[PDB]
Ligand binder design. Structure first.
Ligand SMILES: [Ca+2]
Ligand SMILES: [Ca+2]
Ligand SMILES: [Ca+2]
Ligand SMILES: [Ca+2]
Ligand SMILES: [Ca+2]
Ligand SMILES: [Ca+2]
Lengths: 423, 6
């Protein structure tokens, strides 16, 4: 449905004019959109060292409004690239760009990108709140929980360019308690946050196996590829190496296999014969025999695609008297059991999986603030709306309500903003 | 998914 208009008097954000001279390799940027008749054309990326980058005015997500004094709102994708390719080398082009319409965002997240974003103005108001006697946490929460994670990356850049000190440093010295734990987590890129939460769970021989299972069993292939890279840049050791250090047994093999992020991508053709054979092989390895063939479970549940395994688990009920989750609760035990239980829940319904973990972190005495904060931070821009939807259906009350009754202060207001809505 | 370098 993304908003579209052919009249420039109906655009939201601010406007930018540019003059780019065509080089031997073009203007140095790519464009997306343009199939759908009513679809904007937006800058997807800028070739570094190219004309668009070395001019510094063009940014990703910019709606191309007009090219060479000709409005291109509603132009097809092929009609626009013909304008840029008709320009000879050495000649320039006039681009009117609109900043304020977003791009590859998640339809199910709760924290969306601020339209009238001003990284300089935000870093200004944060410093004023940080330096306020009796630190003004209200404004800090009002800004950071209302910006996208990449917008927070720009605020951290602007804050350091003005005060010559890091934003994470100044906020760590000004905040305390659980509010600090939330705000510092919101300032990390999703890979950096996961990479830090993983190392934090392998602090010693007393590994937090719960947090290790949560991050590994829920992250996709593309998310885990980024985690493995960022984890080595930050800690100078492979994520797999620390997992091998602080795990053992079949639980080690299941965590290492999932962390590689080499799961077979979702296929376009449904393999009905493999769905049945995988279902029988899970049954033959577990309930049907004495003991369990754990390697056969790890191979099937980590290598097949998620849409495939969902069909495998439904077909599995045709052979076994107990479904896949109940089969796990009696074939294996311990940390291995907790891993297979979480993995299967992330395959069947991942939003429902995080809804249960939020309920578990708040149902009892006190709060598992560690689990609660990580789920709200990590899932705020991915599927937070689906998490709230499954939560209210199953538990009657909203996720907002359970956070309200279990947390207080500005720490509560930070979590409620990441949850979204007024309830 | 239309996408072209310029
Ligand atoms: Ca014009
Ligand atoms: Ca205060
Ligand atoms: Ca058995
Ligand atoms: Ca049957
Ligand atoms: Ca509680
Ligand atoms: Ca609890």
């Amino acid at each position: 449905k993304p908003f579209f208009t052919r009249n420039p008097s109906e655009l939201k954000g601010k406007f930018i004019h540019t003059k780019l001279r065509k080089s031997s390799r073009g203007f140095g940027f790519t464009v997306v959109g343009g199939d759908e008749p009513d679809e904007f054309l937006q800058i997807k990326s800028l070739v570094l060292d190219g004309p668009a980058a070395l001019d510094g005015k063009m940014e990703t997500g910019d709606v191309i409004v007009s090219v060479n004094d000709t409005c291109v709102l509603g132009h097809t994708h092929a009609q626009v690239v013909k304008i840029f390719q008709s320009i000879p080398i050495g000649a320039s082009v006039d681009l009117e760009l609109c900043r304020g319409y977003p791009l590859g965002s998640s339809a199910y997240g709760s924290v969306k990108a601020y339209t009238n974003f001003d990284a300089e103005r935000d870093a200004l108001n944060i410093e004023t709140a940080i330096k306020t006697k009796g630190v003004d946490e209200v404004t800090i929460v009002n800004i950071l929980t209302n910006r996208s994670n990449e917008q927070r990356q720009d605020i951290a850049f602007a804050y350091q360019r003005r005060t010559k000190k890091e934003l994470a440093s100044a906020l760590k010295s000004a905040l305390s308690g659980h509010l600090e734990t939330v705000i510092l987590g919101l300032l990390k890129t999703p890979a950096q946050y996961d990479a830090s939460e993983l190392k934090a769970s392998m602090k010693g021989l007393g590994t937090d196996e719960d947090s290790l299972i949560e991050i590994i069993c829920s992250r996709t292939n593309q998310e885990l590829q980024e985690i493995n890279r960022v984890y080595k840049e930050m800690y100078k050791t492979d994520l797999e190496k620390d997992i091998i250090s602080d795990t053992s047994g079949d639980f080690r093999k299941l965590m290492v296999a999932l962390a590689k992020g080499r799961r077979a991508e979702d296929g376009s053709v449904i393999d009905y014969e493999l769905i049945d054979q995988d279902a029988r092989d899970l049954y033959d390895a577990g309930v049907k025999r004495k003991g369990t063939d754990v390697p056969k479970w790890i191979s099937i549940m980590t290598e097949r695609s998620v849409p495939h395994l969902q069909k495998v688990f439904d077909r599995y009920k045709s052979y076994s008297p107990y479904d896949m989750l109940e089969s796990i609760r009696k074939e294996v035990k311990g940390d291995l059991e907790n891993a297979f239980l979480n993995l299967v829940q992330c395959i069947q319904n991942k939003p429902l999986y995080f809804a249960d973990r939020l309920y578990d972190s708040m149902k009892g005495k006190g709060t598992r603030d560690k689990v609660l904060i990580r789920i709200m931070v990590s899932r705020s821009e991915v599927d937070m709306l689906k998490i709230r939807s499954e939560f209210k259906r199953k538990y009657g009350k909203s996720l907002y309500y359970y956070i309200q009754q279990d947390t207080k202060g500005d720490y509560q207001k930070a979590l409620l903003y990441l949850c979204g809505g007024d309830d | 998914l239309p996408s072209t370098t310029l």
